[PDB]
Design a protein around this nucleic acid. Structure first.
Lengths: 128, 178, 259
RNA sequence: AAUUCUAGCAUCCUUCUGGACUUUUACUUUGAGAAAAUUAGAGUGUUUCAAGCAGGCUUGUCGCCUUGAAUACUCAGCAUGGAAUAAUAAGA
RNA sequence: GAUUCAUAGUAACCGAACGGAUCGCGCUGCGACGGAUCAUUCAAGUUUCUGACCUAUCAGCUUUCGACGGUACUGUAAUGGACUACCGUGGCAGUGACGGGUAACGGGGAAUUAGGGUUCGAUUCCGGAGAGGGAGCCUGAGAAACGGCUACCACAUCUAAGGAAGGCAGCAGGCGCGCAAAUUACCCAAUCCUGAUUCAGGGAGGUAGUGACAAGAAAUAACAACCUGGAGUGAUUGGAUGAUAGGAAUCCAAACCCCUUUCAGAGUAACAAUUGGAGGGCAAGUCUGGUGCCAGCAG
RNA sequence: AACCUGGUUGAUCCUGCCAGUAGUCAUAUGCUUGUCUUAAAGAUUAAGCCAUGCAUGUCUAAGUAUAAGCUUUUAUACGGCUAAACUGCGAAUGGCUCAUUAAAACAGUUAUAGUUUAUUUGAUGGUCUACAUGGAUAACCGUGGUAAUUCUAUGGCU
């Protein structure tokens, strides 16, 4: 159904190599806006190189529907954006694949066993 | 543990059973189309905040710097809310308020006053079933209370059958069925 | 008990930071030049005043670039107490912030010129003789300038050079000299000094007069001389420390919001 | 001209250039200093509301409102203007 | 405000403490670490004044074994009957000492609709004390520490019977007490903290589950045409939003809820509102059956 | 909302309590329960007792690398990267509870000329084989003891 973009609270941040701003959007008819569709429109507005520099988050639709508003954050380069941004925000976008770590309870059970053995402890890694 | 304030919007009266009281409350239900006696006691309580504020201020002195500040802030609310008319700005006038002044300002009446709803009861059902755009965005709640610049603004929501949208669901069942 | 407390709590924080009630159980805890309740940590400048950072994580990512300096010196600690009349200098953007007291009683980073951001003032706490019989000032900042003039007494300010270590311009503490307040009820108010009472025992107090002829008092610990009788060494914030009245502050604010 | 406060003149100190003396306090006034949260309360359509401390303008991009988040409240103790009232002192 | 203060000088004293045998990037710059004295900051220890519930079927307490004071040690981080020698005979009390009770941690505060009050405060913050009961101690800037150690007492675990190890008034969970109280869950993403630290860790903390302790908002219908006539009824038909179930995107550390929009989704709107009353106080039946000072009601 | 009704008598006017009424952002409990937002919760008596798992650890260009480890770059002292271990710092904060305790604690208000203070911030300082002093200790290797543990001995290196 399309939407109308109009940013707010812009703050050029050269220390962090990024631009931060709230987006505000108007969409009569349509139910919400996906971030894959929003990142394409905010790219062509701001004359960006690459979608991977841009990262987007928040987005509540208000009560009633039609209106919505959220946050956004245009870096320069994707490699700077990968460094300073935490990984969970990038992942929703899909730029970076999720990292499969082991569980928190399982990790704790290693180190309490690792306390008990002095010397060479590394047999406990394969054993658990 | 959690740092969240909370309060009670109403409180019950001391006498449970008085025929003087129960008759006059039942009129306010019948006029303005209310669910239960809590909705009256809410506004009974809400007035007594504003009334006890003015009662504290009015005892002092007209040149006192507390009264000239806190009075003018209180009078701005009553002009904004459409509760006292702007021709009289005296603090004394706030005392002469009644519950009927508050209950004419809520959105049940201001739909009906507008006349789209037709009947007091119908107006409550139109509010709760996601019609009636107040300003920019639609409003679901009878006990809204309108701020006088906003009152001209109430209109059917853009979405919905009165508004000019998909005709709900039951009209489609008749239309596609035929 | 038993030792120093490593946590500070939100709510039990100072009010003049203006950290909110929700969105955290704890608040950042600032020891450095300045006191706990007469300072503001470097995190809540970056996130809750200047709005560069969003999070506590992002302030570490800023500060460990070595972009932030104070007093022409790089401070890597995110919870460094940056107090009254300290300069902050960011090389990217090329903008500098001298922290003054706002008229309401808050910290605010006042933006200043590049030549002005060299110097800063330090009111001397006392003067004292060190070893080899050499004299030495000590400041509110907790610097210790040595070999002053004999001229320089207690309770008065000195323009430091910062680019070099040494002093440049003194000031005296007398009637008809401009003076900001740093603490208490009348904080953020600047006025000429009319008179001081002695009270030989404890707590000297000073009555002094705002530029709209309002008279008000404070203890000498709070009072901080800026400059001469009218004029001032430093640039001042918005309103110049008048503190207009409650009904005036209402009228100006709601006249703004209607646009 | 009412209502405040204040200098003189009817015999009203002075040691100096603001404090010393006027028996001493209580009392009252103004002022200092005293954490926030809570409480009252300024501002603000969290859809209303309990709340919260946020927001609001706008095809402009070193965004702006040199943005807001006020203020009150907190016996004994420290300080001060004052002619009554009441203790208390005394009796060159 | 005030000194035997800072500091300088003189005459000696001791080793028991400083005056760098350390590390990285690059004649020469930058900073990592170490350590002494002096400020400074985060503190802490003492300390001045004033303030509390009931009890007089508690009126006299304190002392040679410190009670109150004095001199001179000692001890402490320093001041002190803090402690030790000698010496004096004081100190507190009818304005409540001394003793007893508390279903007593203190305060910031909470409930309570004139004013004045009365009752509560284990519990979000700030102090205090404690880690089964008492006592002792090491290391360190800081502990008389208990997710450190030694001992006795009280419980209790494994033992091959010689011995060894234990402290949930941390987070879940269980037994037991009771009128009386939740999951042996997921994660450091937010908030902060510790560290050799941009990177590691955190049952601090946060998210979900249980949840009519509680606070706020508000469904269970609305409108038509077709008997009472001085606007209400009448299941007589009549056509006009979410409860629910599943998507979408959004949210989320990963699920989930909210807010949006979606295909289905009410005609005894069976998607059916109950809880207490109907002699008086107290609003509302001299109704109709059964019972017969019985059963029961009844503040 | 600064509020009052029933009950002593054959009836009245009193004093006077008992009962009624309302609140709790106070517990418990009965019956009933469609929706969303917020959210107290082993305090009351047993500061009674506890199975199992978890709640304190930590590495930078920059204290010590000969893993008989890894990794492709191939370095006559030392290529980096790093398990393990020694050293440093933390573990005295936080969290939980309310049994003690009545001029005690705590509160506001002073004082520290009566003192200790890791760390932070700023100062200061040539004056007593100096191209560099000494010998042991882990991890590691070899090897045992005990039924059993975060028990550890003897021997050899640095």
């Amino acid at each position: 159904g399309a939407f109308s973009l109009r940013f707010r609270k812009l703050k050029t941040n050269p220390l962090l190599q990024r631009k931060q701003f709230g987006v505000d959007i108007l969409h009569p008819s349509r139910g919400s806006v996906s971030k894959k569709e929003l990142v394409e429109k905010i790219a062509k507005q701001f004359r960006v190189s690459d979608s991977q520099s841009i990262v987007v988050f928040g987005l509540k639709t208000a009560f009633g529907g039609g209106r919505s508003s959220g946050f956004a954050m245009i870096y320069d380069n994707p490699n700077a954006a990968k460094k300073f941004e935490n990984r969970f925000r990038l992942v929703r976008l899909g730029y970076v694949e999720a990292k499969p770590t082991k569980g928190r309870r399982a990790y704790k059970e290693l180190k309490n066993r690792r306390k008990k053995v002095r010397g060479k402890e590394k047999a406990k890694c394969s054993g658990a | 543990k959690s740092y969240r304030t909370y309060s009670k919007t109403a409180r019950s009266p001391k006498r449970p059973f008085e025929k003087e009281r129960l008759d006059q409350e039942m009129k306010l239900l019948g006029e303005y189309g209310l669910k239960n006696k809590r909705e009256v006691w809410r506004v009974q309580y809400a007035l007594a905040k504003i009334r006890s504020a003015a009662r504290e201020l009015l005892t002092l002195e007209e040149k006192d710097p507390r009264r000239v500040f806190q009075g003018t802030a209180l009078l701005r609310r009553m002009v904004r809310l459409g509760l006292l008319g702007e021709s009289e700005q005296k603090l004394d006038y706030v005392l002469g308020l009644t519950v009927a002044k508050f209950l004419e300002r809520r959105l049940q009446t201001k739909v009906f006053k507008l006349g789209l709803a037709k009947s007091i009861h119908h107006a409550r059902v139109l509010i709760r079933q996601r019609h009636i755009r107040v300003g920019k965005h639609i409003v679901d709640i009878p006990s809204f209370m309108v701020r006088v610049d906003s009152e001209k603004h109430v209109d059917y929501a853009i979405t919905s059958p009165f508004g000019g949208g998909r005709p709900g669901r039951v009209k489609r069942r008749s239309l596609k069925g035929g | 008990a038993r030792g120093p407390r490593k946590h500070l709590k939100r709510i039990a924080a100072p009010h003049h930071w203006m950290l909110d009630k929700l969105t955290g159980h704890y608040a950042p805890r600032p020891p450095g030049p300045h006191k706990l309740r007469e300072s503001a940590p470097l995190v809540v400048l970056l996130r809750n005043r200047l709005r560069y950072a969003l999070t506590y994580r992002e302030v570490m990512m800023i500060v460990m670039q070595r972009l932030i300096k104070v007093d022409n010196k790089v401070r890597t600690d995110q919870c460094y107490p940056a107090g009254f009349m300290d300069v902050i200098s960011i090389e990217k953007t090329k903008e500098n912030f001298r922290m003054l007291f706002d008229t309401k009683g808050r910290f605010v980073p006042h933006p200043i010129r590049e030549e002005e951001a060299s110097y800063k003032l330090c009111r001397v706490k006392k003067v004292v003789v060190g070893p080899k019989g050499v004299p030495a000032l000590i400041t509110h900042d907790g610097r210790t300038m040595r070999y002053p003039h004999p001229s320089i007494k207690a309770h008065d300010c000195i323009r430091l050079d910062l680019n070099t270590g040494k002093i440049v311009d003194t000031l005296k503490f007398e009637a008809g000299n401009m003076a900001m307040v740093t603490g208490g009820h009348n904080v953020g108010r600047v006025g000429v000094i009319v008179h001081r009472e002695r009270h030989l025992g404890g707590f000297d107090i000073i009555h002094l007069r705002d530029a709209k002829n309002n008279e008000f008092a404070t203890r000498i610990s709070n009072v901080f001389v800026i400059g001469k009788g009218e004029k001032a060494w430093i640039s001042l914030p918005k309103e110049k420390g008048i503190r207009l009245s409650i009904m005036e502050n209402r009228q100006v604010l709601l006249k703004k919001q209607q646009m």
